[PDB]
Design an enzyme around this catalytic site. Structure first.
Site, PDB file in Angstrom:
ATOM      1  CG  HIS A 166      -1.245   5.170  -1.697  1.00 55.59           C
ATOM      2  ND1 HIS A 166      -1.555   3.826  -1.648  1.00 55.59           N
ATOM      3  CD2 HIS A 166      -2.427   5.829  -1.648  1.00 55.59           C
ATOM      4  CE1 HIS A 166      -2.866   3.679  -1.581  1.00 55.59           C
ATOM      5  NE2 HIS A 166      -3.418   4.878  -1.579  1.00 55.59           N
ATOM      6  CG  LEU A 203      -3.534  -5.061 -12.251  1.00 52.31           C
ATOM      7  CD1 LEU A 203      -2.809  -5.173 -13.563  1.00 52.31           C
ATOM      8  CD2 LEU A 203      -2.531  -4.749 -11.139  1.00 52.31           C
ATOM      9  CE1 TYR A 204       1.226  -2.171  -8.070  1.00 50.21           C
ATOM     10  CE2 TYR A 204       0.189  -3.372  -6.269  1.00 50.21           C
ATOM     11  CZ  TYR A 204       1.321  -2.994  -6.959  1.00 50.21           C
ATOM     12  OH  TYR A 204       2.539  -3.408  -6.487  1.00 50.21           O
ATOM     13  CD  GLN A 236      -2.970   1.118   2.344  1.00 47.13           C
ATOM     14  OE1 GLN A 236      -3.881   1.939   2.386  1.00 47.13           O
ATOM     15  NE2 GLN A 236      -2.880   0.109   3.196  1.00 47.13           N
ATOM     16  N   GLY A 269      -0.290  -7.484 -14.825  1.00 50.45           N
ATOM     17  CA  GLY A 269       0.442  -6.699 -13.844  1.00 50.45           C
ATOM     18  C   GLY A 269       1.940  -6.535 -14.044  1.00 50.45           C
ATOM     19  CG  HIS A 298      -8.820  -2.012  -1.415  1.00 55.37           C
ATOM     20  ND1 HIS A 298      -8.530  -1.536  -2.672  1.00 55.37           N
ATOM     21  CD2 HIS A 298      -8.611  -0.966  -0.576  1.00 55.37           C
ATOM     22  CE1 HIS A 298      -8.149  -0.247  -2.553  1.00 55.37           C
ATOM     23  NE2 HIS A 298      -8.175   0.163  -1.295  1.00 55.37           N
ATOM     24  CB  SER A 310       5.185  -4.469 -12.108  1.00 58.22           C
ATOM     25  OG  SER A 310       3.987  -4.359 -11.368  1.00 58.22           O
TER      26      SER A 310
HETATM   27  C1  COH Z   1      -2.726  -2.548  -2.840  1.00 54.99           C
HETATM   28  C2  COH Z   1      -2.879  -1.225  -2.284  1.00 54.99           C
HETATM   29  C3  COH Z   1      -3.903  -0.740  -1.386  1.00 54.99           C
HETATM   30  C4  COH Z   1      -4.249  -1.112  -0.086  1.00 54.99           C
HETATM   31  C5  COH Z   1      -3.622  -2.236   0.809  1.00 54.99           C
HETATM   32  C6  COH Z   1      -5.355  -0.248   0.290  1.00 54.99           C
HETATM   33  C7  COH Z   1      -5.978  -0.296   1.521  1.00 54.99           C
HETATM   34  C8  COH Z   1      -7.025   0.471   1.987  1.00 54.99           C
HETATM   35  C9  COH Z   1      -7.636   0.354   3.335  1.00 54.99           C
HETATM   36  C10 COH Z   1      -7.250  -0.587   4.411  1.00 54.99           C
HETATM   37  C11 COH Z   1      -6.809  -0.231   5.670  1.00 54.99           C
HETATM   38  C12 COH Z   1      -8.631   1.287   3.388  1.00 54.99           C
HETATM   39  C13 COH Z   1      -9.572   1.597   4.527  1.00 54.99           C
HETATM   40  C14 COH Z   1      -8.608   1.945   2.074  1.00 54.99           C
HETATM   41  C15 COH Z   1      -9.462   2.944   1.724  1.00 54.99           C
HETATM   42  C16 COH Z   1      -9.491   3.585   0.547  1.00 54.99           C
HETATM   43  N1  COH Z   1      -8.643   3.307  -0.484  1.00 54.99           N
HETATM   44 CO1  COH Z   1      -7.171   1.969  -0.631  1.00 54.99          CO
HETATM   45  N2  COH Z   1      -5.678   0.608  -0.741  1.00 54.99           N
HETATM   46  C17 COH Z   1      -4.802   0.302  -1.715  1.00 54.99           C
HETATM   47  C18 COH Z   1      -4.796   0.954  -2.920  1.00 54.99           C
HETATM   48  C19 COH Z   1      -5.682   2.002  -3.279  1.00 54.99           C
HETATM   49  C20 COH Z   1      -5.677   2.751  -4.644  1.00 54.99           C
HETATM   50  C21 COH Z   1      -4.674   2.415  -5.754  1.00 54.99           C
HETATM   51  C22 COH Z   1      -6.702   3.650  -4.532  1.00 54.99           C
HETATM   52  C23 COH Z   1      -7.290   4.626  -5.601  1.00 54.99           C
HETATM   53  C24 COH Z   1      -6.837   6.103  -5.492  1.00 54.99           C
HETATM   54  C25 COH Z   1      -5.433   6.410  -5.912  1.00 54.99           C
HETATM   55  O1  COH Z   1      -4.514   6.358  -5.052  1.00 54.99           O
HETATM   56  O2  COH Z   1      -5.248   6.720  -7.100  1.00 54.99           O
HETATM   57  C26 COH Z   1      -7.288   3.490  -3.222  1.00 54.99           C
HETATM   58  C27 COH Z   1      -8.354   4.247  -2.761  1.00 54.99           C
HETATM   59  C28 COH Z   1      -9.015   4.217  -1.520  1.00 54.99           C
HETATM   60  C29 COH Z   1     -10.179   5.123  -1.084  1.00 54.99           C
HETATM   61  C30 COH Z   1     -10.926   6.307  -1.877  1.00 54.99           C
HETATM   62  C31 COH Z   1     -12.181   5.933  -2.730  1.00 54.99           C
HETATM   63  C32 COH Z   1     -11.970   4.945  -3.894  1.00 54.99           C
HETATM   64  O3  COH Z   1     -11.144   5.248  -4.818  1.00 54.99           O
HETATM   65  O4  COH Z   1     -12.685   3.902  -3.939  1.00 54.99           O
HETATM   66  C33 COH Z   1     -10.505   4.719   0.263  1.00 54.99           C
HETATM   67  C34 COH Z   1     -11.578   5.261   1.224  1.00 54.99           C
HETATM   68  N3  COH Z   1      -6.639   2.457  -2.450  1.00 54.99           N
HETATM   69  N4  COH Z   1      -7.625   1.458   1.195  1.00 54.99           N
HETATM   70  C1  LAX Z   2       5.561   1.611 -11.876  1.00 56.94           C
HETATM   71  C2  LAX Z   2       6.204   1.433 -10.494  1.00 56.94           C
HETATM   72  C3  LAX Z   2       6.336  -0.035 -10.071  1.00 56.94           C
HETATM   73  C4  LAX Z   2       5.009  -0.776 -10.139  1.00 56.94           C
HETATM   74  C5  LAX Z   2       5.174  -2.276  -9.901  1.00 56.94           C
HETATM   75  C6  LAX Z   2       5.596  -2.864  -8.526  1.00 56.94           C
HETATM   76  C7  LAX Z   2       4.894  -3.915  -8.007  1.00 56.94           C
HETATM   77  C8  LAX Z   2       3.712  -4.475  -8.780  1.00 56.94           C
HETATM   78  C9  LAX Z   2       2.953  -5.609  -8.200  1.00 56.94           C
HETATM   79  C10 LAX Z   2       2.789  -6.810  -8.883  1.00 56.94           C
HETATM   80  C11 LAX Z   2       3.381  -7.035 -10.276  1.00 56.94           C
HETATM   81  C12 LAX Z   2       2.563  -7.788 -11.288  1.00 56.94           C
HETATM   82  C13 LAX Z   2       2.186  -9.091 -11.062  1.00 56.94           C
HETATM   83  C14 LAX Z   2       2.588  -9.805  -9.792  1.00 56.94           C
HETATM   84  C15 LAX Z   2       3.330 -11.137  -9.831  1.00 56.94           C
HETATM   85  C16 LAX Z   2       4.701 -11.017 -10.456  1.00 56.94           C
HETATM   86  C17 LAX Z   2       4.585 -10.613 -11.893  1.00 56.94           C
HETATM   87  C18 LAX Z   2       5.163 -11.656 -12.801  1.00 56.94           C
HETATM   88  C19 LAX Z   2       6.657 -11.527 -12.865  1.00 56.94           C
HETATM   89  C20 LAX Z   2       7.165 -11.875 -14.234  1.00 56.94           C
HETATM   90  O1  LAX Z   2       6.853 -12.992 -14.693  1.00 56.94           O
HETATM   91  O2  LAX Z   2       7.859 -11.040 -14.855  1.00 56.94           O
END
Ligand code: COH
Ligand code: LAX
Ligand SMILES: *[C@@H]1O[C@H](CO)[C@@H](O[C@@H]2O[C@H](CO)[C@@H](O[C@@H]3O[C@H](CO[C@@H]4O[C@H](CO)[C@@H](O)[C@H](O[C@H]5O[C@H](CO)[C@@H](O)[C@H](O)[C@@H]5O)[C@@H]4O)[C@@H](O)[C@H](O)[C@@H]3O)[C@H](O)[C@H]2NC(C)=O)[C@H](O)[C@H]1NC(C)=O
Ligand SMILES: *[C@@H]1O[C@H](CO)[C@@H](O[C@@H]2O[C@H](CO)[C@@H](O[C@@H]3O[C@H](CO[C@@H]4O[C@H](CO)[C@@H](O)[C@H](O[C@H]5O[C@H](CO)[C@@H](O)[C@H](O)[C@@H]5O)[C@@H]4O)[C@@H](O)[C@H](O)[C@@H]3O)[C@H](O)[C@H]2NC(C)=O)[C@H](O)[C@H]1NC(C)=O
Ligand code: COH
Ligand SMILES: *[C@@H]1O[C@H](CO)[C@@H](O[C@@H]2O[C@H](CO)[C@@H](O)[C@H](O)[C@H]2NC(C)=O)[C@H](O)[C@H]1NC(C)=O
Ligand SMILES: *[C@@H]1O[C@H](CO)[C@@H](O[C@@H]2O[C@H](CO)[C@@H](O)[C@H](O)[C@H]2NC(C)=O)[C@H](O)[C@H]1NC(C)=O
Ligand SMILES: *[C@@H]1O[C@H](CO)[C@@H](O[C@H]2O[C@H](CO)[C@@H](O)[C@H](O)[C@H]2NC(C)=O)[C@H](O)[C@H]1NC(C)=O
Ligand SMILES: *[C@@H]1O[C@H](CO)[C@@H](O[C@H]2O[C@H](CO)[C@@H](O)[C@H](O)[C@H]2NC(C)=O)[C@H](O)[C@H]1NC(C)=O
Ligand code: LAX
Ligand code: BOG
Ligand code: BOG
Ligand code: BOG
Ligand code: BOG
Ligand code: BOG
Ligand code: BOG
Lengths: 553, 553
Positions: free
Chosen positions: A176, A353-354, A172, A495, A357, A499
């Site tokens: 960000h 894709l990322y 996370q 992904g 949650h 990545s």
């Molecule tokens: C894999 C990454 C990850 C994690 C673990 C995570 C974990 C959590 C978490 C757990 C404690 C909470 C309460 C939230 C809560 C939110 N997240 Co994320 N988020 C994550 C990646 C994102 C992304 C990417 C966005 C979209 C906005 C952006 O940053 O562009 C996001 C957006 C949000 C929003 C704004 C509205 C929406 O776009 O739907 C809320 C509220 N959240 N997130």
């Molecule tokens: C643009 C800045 C960096 C973004 C990328 C960093 C982490 C991305 C998270 C997951 C990557 C995509 C898929 C996850 C599994 C591994 C991917 C396959 C690896 C491979 O075969 O090359």
């Protein structure tokens, strides 16, 4: 008439173009095929296509020869595969970038207006019959329903791959710095300019916020000793914007660089770890270069962190996620002989894709305690209460949760997921299937095929009506996973190309920048060539707890 | 102590780095040499060096085999040399860029803050003994004196190469889309973000100014028929900033995109020509694509002009300047097999170097008339008075002036030149000689060698005291020219690497972007593949006058 590009006639990345009032043309230039819609393989492509094994198979080789691999690992064959894995994966992201939310065609604007997120595939024409172009019902499934019905978690399904929470957050935190959709400008725009690993979630995303954060002395960053251990500085010295709730804006109201990082101990935690690192990198440098000022000490240590991060993310983050026997490796020189643009532009599709949650668990165990979301979220002493060592050891022990399969997104955050499905529509991303093609895969023929099961499958058909109508974010989670894998096929196949293109496309990774002088000294260069999660922590603490992207045992 | 990097110990592009209190280290990574200062040739480099002919010789081959060349011209050998000329020349500009006015080392900031102009060589350390580092007098020659003494024109020395005024302006116009030093931020900063051929001197350098200029209908640009012929629009419809003198801010006070383009008919002239072209490109496109909106028609036609320009600049602009028998060629595909970054960042050194003010003549003949500077400068009816056809025919007939040799900068503008020498000092560009090295040349051993003559030579020594002290902008003009050449050796050897890196480093030139669909249709693609100076004009007029980068006869 019906805007012909609504059928997506062009295959293999051919560019659809309206000509006249009702006709169209496909630009198959360098697509490897010729023909009205790029459907006739060139002599070689044909060779390529007939001799190319399925992604299904490849993922099988990489996850099975526990012997053939230990050997391939201990040899150059490792580097060959790495150099292979990279190039090939990255060759899928159009660079220079292509389109944005405003243009479904190449434009000088698209190229230069950093604000715009970039799209891989154009968008479903605003005039197309169906929401997705040609097939489907006059209305996409009510995302409120779609969510709770298939994405809402019932019983917590832990990640078979061993992934833990210590990973859940780093993931996370790390993501960000490039994903920062602007509430103001809206979906399809980003505040996180630089589109990559510039740590603008540490040093902030603007010179000022940086300066306001910078302790302009020894190139270090501000901070405050609480309990004896170093933590970030509060707004009362680091006078910079944040989002802490209206309550105690003075004490324990810390400035970080990533505005939202106060809303969860995990974020502030890492935030602390890195800051603690930066200043640490400064201490070393300064010894090596006394005749150095503040600006240098700062910039150089920054690069040493842009490095370190790119190394841990690859040899440890992606590794764990991959499940490969092949031991990934970060060595920028592997591409010094390839044609590779050192530039990146985050993509809206890579953004959706990322949204992993479903990683977030039910509660949050911390030794004997067991904080809930109410307790956890927006808490503000937990971090300084427990101390880094301890909190790290706690996440590195509690498992994360399967990201695919469907139904594993905690209810508290399930709202996010519904908005993602709403925005996707605002954006007008083409059908899930249409993205499968674009990313070297075959389009699903049925929901029964998509999903391993039969239930969700039938029901979904009932809703979307036709597999092709299916959406991007939903399919990506409702897809069956590789056995024991943290997530299905389409997630990796879609992904990785985003990545790795991003990780290596970073300026520091280029020949030009990849020298020991860019990190001033050999010492700097090694800190990058040897970073570890274990080191990013235990080298910035008093005691060495347990830390890794997977649960012990 | 004496900051060791003040001697410039590192050779062959080795990076100088202070280590400890008084020592330094050279980072010879990939410089081809090893050793304390990168002075020991690697097995190959040695081969390379021993077998590499002088630039003097090369420039001789390219300007002599009027037979061997007509043949090499009519064959692939042409493409081979082009692909050679390019790659090799461009391989000299560090990309990703390196330093700026603020950092004499690689930094994330330097990389991302587009505002900063970029420097090839770092700067003379603020603590170095002499102004230029090690050799010279405690004070550089009073630039007021230096100028008038050696750069001030006495008798107008016309360009032996035939260059005319029609070229003199295009040159000026064209170069002002990337050279736009910010009075506010000061020397070393630029408003012209995009650093290249983005025609942001037409469509302006900001979305708004563009919009204010855009007639948002048929993708065309605003304009006004005066005498029956199309001209740019005045601020009274195109409500945008300019610099016209406080007098008649309403009528004949035209908006263009390049703020300063009212201050000389030549600039406004071309400005008109291009606008006249753009809208022309729109008329064609619209016929090919009725189902197209305004945004598209605009962007696509823009690219068709970014193309056209890059073609004429290369196959006609650089050609004339070059004097080569080899017939230059613009075909982006020539690099599709090379490792070439498609990104550019204008350099302060490339900026200084482009100060070809001595091009401007004594007066300005226009048929029987003969306007002086007073008359010419800031005039505002001359353009609409005479009409494009006529004015073009007039410049294409009056010669320009030798740019090198020394003493050929009209007095009116001689002030510019003195400021360039002042800024250069503000900037702290290393010695002329130090730049010779960096650009694959040998450092001069004496002024007598620098200059062909003996006078200016001795006198200059008297001033600078030591050849090495000599400056960048001055040496570049005081250098002896190749016989009959418009300018000396150092100008081409230093200019081309900046120019071609810039011309081909343009996004449109990349594989990704170089398709017929990027110019929507085959028609667009051909307009780029066949642009001419003669066409940019005669295709936007009533009658075809005389036009070329050289005088007739
Ligand atoms: C894999 C990454 C990850 C994690 C673990 C995570 C974990 C959590 C978490 C757990 C404690 C909470 C309460 C939230 C809560 C939110 N997240 Co994320 N988020 C994550 C990646 C994102 C992304 C990417 C966005 C979209 C906005 C952006 O940053 O562009 C996001 C957006 C949000 C929003 C704004 C509205 C929406 O776009 O739907 C809320 C509220 N959240 N997130
Ligand atoms: C643009 C800045 C960096 C973004 C990328 C960093 C982490 C991305 C998270 C997951 C990557 C995509 C898929 C996850 C599994 C591994 C991917 C396959 C690896 C491979 O075969 O090359
Ligand atoms: C990246 O791209 C985004 C857009 O995708 C940029 O942000 C947007 O920027 C635009 C313009 O800066 C902004 O404009 C909106 O449009 C309103 C409409 O404007 C009116 O209609 C035309 C438009 O030019 C004019 O003819 C009108 O007449 C005016 O003319 C006078 C001239 O002096 C004006 O002074 C007078 O007001 C008169 O009305 C009129 O302007 C506009 O009024 C309003 O500003 C509105 O915001 C978008 O809203 C921006 N926001 C977004 C996210 O879309 C962004 O800048 C780009 N990034 C970078 C840094 O390049
Ligand atoms: C590209 O790079 C250029 C610079 O090379 C950028 O332009 C420059 O930007 C900086 C900052 O945006 C600007 O700053 C100048 O410095 C003054 C000094 O500031 C004081 O000292 C420190 C600095 O942080 C603070 O501790 C001081 O305390 C303040 O803290 C409070 C916090 O809320 C303040 O509100 C309060 O005022 C208090 O004093 C104090 O700030 C600064 O005051 C002043 O703004 C001044 O301009 C440079 O002047 C800029 N100009 C240039 C060309 O150098 C440019 O932004 C970069 N480009 C992009 C788009 O990234
Ligand atoms: C080969 C291009 C070219 C030509 C033909 C040209 C022709 C003329 C000309 C003849 C009619 C006049 C009166 C001027 C006058 C000026 N030029 Co130029 N200039 C040119 C390229 C430049 C550049 C480059 C700059 C520096 C500022 C920038 O654009 O970054 C410049 C700057 C200036 C300045 C500002 C002060 C300074 O930087 O010294 C004045 C005044 N001028 N220029
Ligand atoms: C914020 O976190 C703290 C702990 O870091 C919470 O306090 C703990 O609460 C549990 C029960 O909920 C007690 O048994 C512990 O003894 C407490 N720890 C201490 C010493 O403070 C606190 O409740 C949380 N606040 C919020 C926002 O809910
Ligand atoms: C601006 O340019 C115009 C011509 O375009 C100048 O007017 C000409 O001046 C000459 C003598 O200087 C006359 O012989 C011509 O007949 C004039 N042309 C016409 C019909 O206007 C004018 O003097 C210039 N103004 C400035 C700024 O000096
Ligand atoms: C190229 O793509 C189009 C778009 O689907 C194909 O469809 C056209 O022709 C079909 C075959 O006869 C018909 O079923 C469709 O009515 C018709 N639709 C359109 C959009 O024109 C076309 O056949 C494809 N060509 C090839 C070689 O497969
Ligand atoms: C590397 O560069 C330095 C800098 O000029 C050279 O100079 C040092 O050694 C010289 C040779 O003995 C002396 O003349 C200088 O006093 C001394 N100065 C400095 C800056 O240290 C050094 O010799 C060069 N080494 C090689 C191999 O040529
Ligand atoms: C960055 C945008 C484009 C900038 C360059 C366009 C024109 C530059 C003017 C002159 C170029 C440099 C030297 C002039 C003579 C020709 C150069 C030698 C050609 C060669 O041998 O490759
Ligand atoms: C079996 C692995 C051999 C070495 C790596 C080869 C390239 C792996 O990388 C990827 O593999 C996918 C299959 O899952 C393909 O669909 C992608 O196009 C390819 O880039
Ligand atoms: C070298 C090419 C051989 C033919 C193509 C691959 C053969 C089928 O490959 C199979 O794909 C399945 C799908 O996930 C995997 O589950 C199996 O483990 C794998 O053997
Ligand atoms: C056969 C392809 C090369 C690599 C094979 C790795 C897996 C081989 O399978 C082996 O089966 C044995 C029977 O229980 C076990 O003792 C081994 O631990 C196991 O690795
Ligand atoms: C003689 C020309 C042969 C084909 C072009 C070779 C590369 C020309 O280009 C340039 O030539 C200069 C000499 O003037 C060298 O100093 C430069 O390094 C080289 O890039
Ligand atoms: C192939 C390498 C041969 C030896 C190096 C080049 C030989 C000298 O080259 C000479 O250089 C002079 C300097 O401008 C030119 O004026 C002469 O025309 C040229 O013959
Ligand atoms: C010799 C190297 C190959 C190309 C040679 C081109 C120049 C040859 O020199 C020739 O001299 C003759 C004597 O006056 C003239 O008639 C020709 O026009 C001239 O080109």
């Amino acid at each position: 008439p019906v805007n012909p590009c609504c059928y997506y006639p062009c295959q293999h990345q051919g560019i659809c173009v309206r000509f006249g009032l009702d006709r169209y043309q496909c630009d198959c230039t360098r697509t490897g095929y010729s023909g009205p819609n790029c459907t006739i393989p060139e002599i070689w492509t044909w060779l390529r296509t007939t001799l190319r094994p399925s992604p299904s198979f490849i993922h099988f080789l990489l996850t099975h020869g526990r012997w053939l691999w230990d050997f391939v690992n201990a040899t150059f064959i490792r580097d060959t595969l790495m150099r292979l894995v990279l190039t090939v994966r990255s060759n899928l992201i159009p660079s220079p970038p292509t389109y944005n939310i405003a243009h479904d065609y190449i434009s000088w604007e698209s190229f230069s207006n950093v604000s715009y997120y970039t799209r891989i595939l154009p968008s479903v024409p605003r005039d197309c019959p169906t929401p997705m172009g040609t097939k489907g019902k006059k209305q996409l499934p009510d995302a409120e329903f779609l969510s709770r019905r298939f994405l809402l978690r019932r019983k917590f399904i832990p990640d078979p791959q061993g992934t833990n929470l210590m990973f859940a957050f780093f993931a996370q935190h790390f993501t960000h710095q490039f994903f920062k959709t602007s509430g103001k400008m809206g979906p399809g725009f980003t505040k996180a300019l630089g589109h990559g690993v510039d740590l603008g979630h540490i040093y902030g995303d603007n010179l000022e916020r940086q300066y306001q954060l910078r302790l302009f002395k020894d190139g270090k960053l501000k901070y405050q000793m609480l309990n004896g251990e170093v933590y970030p500085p509060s707004v009362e010295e680091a006078p910079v914007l944040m989002h802490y709730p209206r309550g105690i804006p003075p004490q324990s109201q810390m400035a970080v660089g990533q505005e939202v990082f106060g809303l969860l101990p995990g974020l502030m935690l890492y935030a602390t770890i890195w800051l603690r690192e930066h200043n640490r990198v400064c201490d070393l440098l300064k010894a090596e270069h006394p005749t150095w000022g503040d600006e240098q000490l700062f910039q150089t240590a920054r690069l040493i962190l842009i490095g370190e991060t790119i190394k841990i993310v690859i040899e440890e983050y992606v590794q764990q996620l991959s499940g490969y026997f092949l031991q990934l490796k970060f060595d920028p020189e592997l591409l010094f002989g390839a044609q590779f643009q050192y530039r990146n532009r985050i993509a809206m599709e890579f953004n959706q894709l990322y949204h992993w949650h479903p990683l977030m668990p039910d509660s949050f165990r911390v030794g004997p305690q067991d904080y809930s979301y109410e307790q956890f979220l927006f808490n503000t002493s937990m971090l300084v209460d427990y101390g880094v060592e301890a909190l790290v050891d706690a996440f590195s022990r509690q498992p994360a949760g399967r990201i695919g399969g469907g139904r594993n997104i905690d209810h508290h955050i399930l709202h996010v997921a519904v908005d993602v499905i709403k925005e996707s529509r605002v954006l007008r991303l083409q059908p899930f299937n249409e993205y499968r093609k674009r990313f070297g895969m075959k389009p699903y023929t049925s929901f029964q095929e998509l999903t391993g099961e039969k239930e969700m499958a039938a029901e979904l058909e009932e809703l979307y009506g036709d597999i092709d109508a299916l959406e991007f974010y939903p399919g990506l989670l409702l897809e069956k996973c590789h056995p024991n894998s943290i997530f299905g096929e389409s997630m990796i196949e879609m992904g990785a190309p985003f990545s790795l293109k991003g990780l290596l496309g970073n300026p520091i990774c280029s020949p030009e920048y990849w020298k020991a002088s860019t990190f001033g000294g050999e010492v700097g260069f090694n800190l990058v060539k040897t970073a570890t999660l274990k080191k990013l922590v235990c080298l910035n603490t008093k005691t060495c707890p347990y830390v890794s992207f997977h649960v012990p045992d």
